[PDB]
């Protein structure tokens, strides 16, 4: 009589040995199907084309942000120095120490 | 399924066999029921009817 | 207000235009209102075309052409910031001048 | 109070009748001829009437077959050759290279037949005559007109083949 | 204008008072009628934005194909427009010229979003429900019909509480809880 | 979140709908790329298709994990919840603990009276990536279901030849190190799909000296699962069986979570086809 | 049209619906008086919305509660939740906000599950 | 003659001369030169198996405009 499906294969000594020899060979070859971690000079005419496209892209993404953005959309835009120079122009100051750390000096 | 066999040993020799219905529905003998003796469990591709007849082809 | 007024060449129709967008075309002697528009916009001048059937309004930026009932037919993108409108009735030419310092003649029959 | 969703009235190009495209906006099943059997035209009998096409005359002259004599030899019966106004106009439009064909068409044994249609298109004129009345035999060598006449049932077709005229779809000619 | 006679039409072939070539088929009026746009200049502002997109796409195309700059910027533009909802797919670069339309932006306006969300039966009904103070996008009430909805912002377009519409739908399902204010 | 997941499911199904026409246009573009490279004539339809040739000037700059796994492949490690059927026996609880220890980021959760729609919602809001449900027949594990979240594939496997560490190992504890995976003899697209599903249950990038090896080997549509420990002797690598051994058989793969029965079937086992014996699908 | 209020209470598969309208003091559950709510051992759980605020708050209203689903315990908790929420909603709709706030304070001080539904959803670890 | 890039460079030498005011390589060529050279290559590939009517079809121009352009070009 005809059987409808192949029976479930039994695990025997030769099957186990073949499996273990495959595992041994792949360990020796270091072949491992592992999941790998995903991370994280042009010319002058090409540079001019890139600069023009960068400016156009900046303006376009500004206008699209104005359309879809929940808040107000701003327009798209360390040497040794005293911090009192880094402040804004007004009679007072609040911080005195120079910008560079001792480890940076 | 009943009346195909007379005992669970007879069923257990024929387990895994193709069977079919006079309608044409194909199925498989799966296991022998404990009680009563000749009965067995079968799985088909569709629901079958109590008017159906199950046949197993041998030579 | 204030209202800039224009009369048809027959004189049978009157076209008033407020600065705040109230533009009306009427048969002033009959007392029959042909059209009335509330554009909610700055309007400077209006003129009739060859009939009372068509009129042009110089709105905030662009000049618009409306029919007798008041539906917008045309928005003339080429005429920008016109303050003065005119029509030459034998040449079918609508003439616009304004803030840009450009005089533009548009054929109202062909477009 | 003001209504909600107020919009400015503009020109509806879909539904305004003043525009040209919007401004543009019984059953007849003809009877089958009583002259016909299922494919056999039984009313037709001698003397036959033969509507001639221009290229029939040209091939007649090239093969040196007389028109009336050749038709009588083909049919073994008397015939009336008919040239329509559009056929004669096509022969006249053919130019000065075909004045022999023009004169042999002017031959008085060929009877003229008036046309009341605009233009000069012998194919549609002859096909309309055929589709109206089943009394005609179409003489032509044009492939397209041959196919049209073959599609129309009950219409004999004459052609210039080899040494003499050949008839088709007329059961009487033996 | 009455219908021109035959000899008049030949001398007056170009005459047309209702359709001019500068009208461009009244495409703007057609789009505003489809999506119930109230402001007259909305189509032309949208058209200028579409023109910026198409100009940038043309320049990126004139860049050489195996350019990392070109590929990066085309993917940036496709992702940004898809996130806004203007582009339905991110598969093709050519959609940046073929599938950027004014109607694509107008389908992201709030009444069209509500009509697609089955909140209103027509876009005009949605417009009126917006101006009548029934609609909030998050905690914030929006009575501007021109407000554009992002794909992320679709999930918070809901009826305001204490809305007669909301009470009506809850009362229809017999699920109105007056403790929740409905 | 109820409105977000439905919308994202709709967008995912729309992408699956448009994928066929996108592929067809991809082969139409691939003829043009070969024709331009080799100077070969175009076919008549591509020659007379002016729109495709006009769009090729844009689409010339278009160039792999599956769609459900693309966003986070190697970025964020999985979170797996291992649970059982409704009233598990002690031996099923032991096997569930074994499977939890097999996976490196997996927690074993008591089923209790938990409804499957409530459990799936809990998993979604808690941010777990995968749910593994284990079934048994009187102490013998018979079925293993893996469902990916939020709307990922659901694969169902029939377990055979199950041997447990509680039986074979008298003593010793499992290493619980990020292991090295070996996927053997998966050739067809179904095999690649199963490899993707099983591979993304494990953390990305095990370090080179890792002594744990987990092996999934395809023999005649049956996947043998082994866990071994190796020591690199100068003579060779000796191997110690350290984990459970079982054979698993994919019989159903659906494009939805475990709660959804209306999910589209990517693949189903067909037992009663006439030529079912001849083919090997994995 | 009398002033009336509809509110819901839930506990597992049980669901209670309370209609609180202007009336004389009829408090009925499933067409039967509130004093026949079974079990005896859990009747005061049903009683306690009444007893926390006083029967004078119920002197001028009619409460009608229809309960389906669940078991005895779940149904008792659904009843008491629906009655408390219906009191708060009626005193906010047709009586003063000060009365509503005082009722909400009393109910919250005793048991918040009278007002807000207790949902025991799973927490994966 | 079997070689490709030489014959392509010879065929497109006029376009590169016109628009590069060498950058003949495909990974360097930008702008109008890239657009018109791609159009030339695609048209050449489509010519042999495409019906000529559907392959080359002119941009629609009014009669007097096109006749004047042809006359000036022929001059
Ligand atoms: Zn005729």
Swiss-Prot record, chain B:
Localization: Cytoplasm; Nucleus, Nucleolus
Protein family: Belongs to the TRAFAC class translation factor GTPase superfamily. Bms1-like GTPase family. BMS1 subfamily.
Subunit structure and binding partners: Interacts directly with RCL1 and the U3 snoRNA to form a stable subcomplex. Component of the 90S small subunit processome also known as 90S pre-ribosome that consists of the 35S pre-rRNA, early-associating ribosomal proteins most of which are part of the small ribosomal subunit, the U3 snoRNA and associated proteins.
Described function: GTPase required for synthesis of 40S ribosomal subunits and for processing the 35S pre-rRNA at sites A0, A1, and A2. Controls access of pre-ribosomal RNA intermediates to RCL1 during ribosome biogenesis by binding of RCL1 in a GTP-dependent manner and, via its affinity to U3 snoRNA, delivering it to pre-ribosomes. GTP-binding and/or GTP hydrolysis may induce conformational rearrangements within the BMS1-RCL1 complex allowing the interaction of RCL1 with its RNA substrate. Required for RCL1 import into the nucleus.
Protein name: Ribosome biogenesis protein BMS1
Protein source organism: Saccharomyces cerevisiae (strain ATCC 204508 / S288c)
Section of the entire sequence shown: 948 to 1006 of 1183
Swiss-Prot record, chain C:
WD repeats: 1-38
Gene Ontology terms: cellular component: 90S preribosome; nucleolus; nucleoplasm; preribosome, small subunit precursor; small-subunit processome
Keywords: Nucleus, Repeat, Ribonucleoprotein, Ribosome biogenesis, rRNA processing, WD repeat
GO terms, biological process: endonucleolytic cleavage in 5'-ETS of tricistronic rRNA transcript (SSU-rRNA, 5.8S rRNA, LSU-rRNA); endonucleolytic cleavage in ITS1 to separate SSU-rRNA from 5.8S rRNA and LSU-rRNA from tricistronic rRNA transcript (SSU-rRNA, 5.8S rRNA, LSU-rRNA); endonucleolytic cleavage to generate mature 5'-end of SSU-rRNA from (SSU-rRNA, 5.8S rRNA, LSU-rRNA); maturation of SSU-rRNA; maturation of SSU-rRNA from tricistronic rRNA transcript (SSU-rRNA, 5.8S rRNA, LSU-rRNA)
UniProt subcellular location: Nucleus, Nucleolus
Domain of life: Eukaryota
Function: Involved in nucleolar processing of pre-18S ribosomal RNA.
Note: Present with 5800 molecules/cell in log phase SD medium.
Subunit structure, interactors included: Interacts with snoRNA U3. Interacts with MPP10. Component of the ribosomal small subunit (SSU) processome composed of at least 40 protein subunits and snoRNA U3.
UniProt protein name: U3 small nucleolar RNA-associated protein 7
Organism: Saccharomyces cerevisiae (strain ATCC 204508 / S288c) (Baker's yeast)
UniProtKB/Swiss-Prot annotation, chain D:
Entry's Gene Ontology molecular function annotations: RNA endonuclease activity
Keyword Nucleus: yes
CDD domains linked to this entry: PIN_Fcf1-like
Domain PINc: start-end pairs: 48-147
A Pfam family that the UniProt record links to this protein: Fcf1
Any single GO CC term annotated in Swiss-Prot or TrEMBL for this entry: nucleoplasm
Keyword line: Nucleus, Ribosome biogenesis, rRNA processing
InterPro entries reported in the protein's UniProt record: Fcf1/Utp23, Fcf1_PIN, PIN-like_dom_sf, PIN_dom
Subcellular localization, as worded in the UniProt entry: Nucleus, Nucleolus
Biological processes, Gene Ontology terms: endonucleolytic cleavage in 5'-ETS of tricistronic rRNA transcript (SSU-rRNA, 5.8S rRNA, LSU-rRNA); endonucleolytic cleavage in ITS1 to separate SSU-rRNA from 5.8S rRNA and LSU-rRNA from tricistronic rRNA transcript (SSU-rRNA, 5.8S rRNA, LSU-rRNA); endonucleolytic cleavage to generate mature 5'-end of SSU-rRNA from (SSU-rRNA, 5.8S rRNA, LSU-rRNA); maturation of SSU-rRNA
Tree of life domain: Eukaryota
Primary location: nucleus
Stated role: Essential protein involved in pre-rRNA processing and 40S ribosomal subunit assembly. Required for the early cleavage steps of 35S rRNA at the A(0), A(1), and A(2) sites.
Oligomeric form and interacting partners: Interacts with FAF1.
PANTHER family: RRNA-PROCESSING PROTEIN UTP23 HOMOLOG
Family statement drawn from the similarity comment of this UniProt entry: Belongs to the UTP23/FCF1 family. FCF1 subfamily.
Record protein name field: rRNA-processing protein FCF1
Organism from which the protein derives: Saccharomyces cerevisiae (strain ATCC 204508 / S288c)
Native organism taxonomy: Eukaryota, Fungi, Dikarya, Ascomycota, Saccharomycotina
Swiss-Prot record, chain F:
Keywords of the record: Nucleus, Ribonucleoprotein, Ribosome biogenesis, rRNA processing
Gene Ontology molecular functions: RNA folding chaperone; rRNA primary transcript binding; single-stranded telomeric DNA binding; snoRNA binding
Keyword Lyase attached: no
GO cellular component entries: 90S preribosome; Mpp10 complex; nucleolus; nucleoplasm; small-subunit processome
Domain Brix: 78-259
Annotated effect of mutating residue 212 to A: Loss of RNA binding
Name used for this protein in its record: U3 small nucleolar ribonucleoprotein protein IMP4
Source organism (scientific name): Saccharomyces cerevisiae (strain ATCC 204508 / S288c)
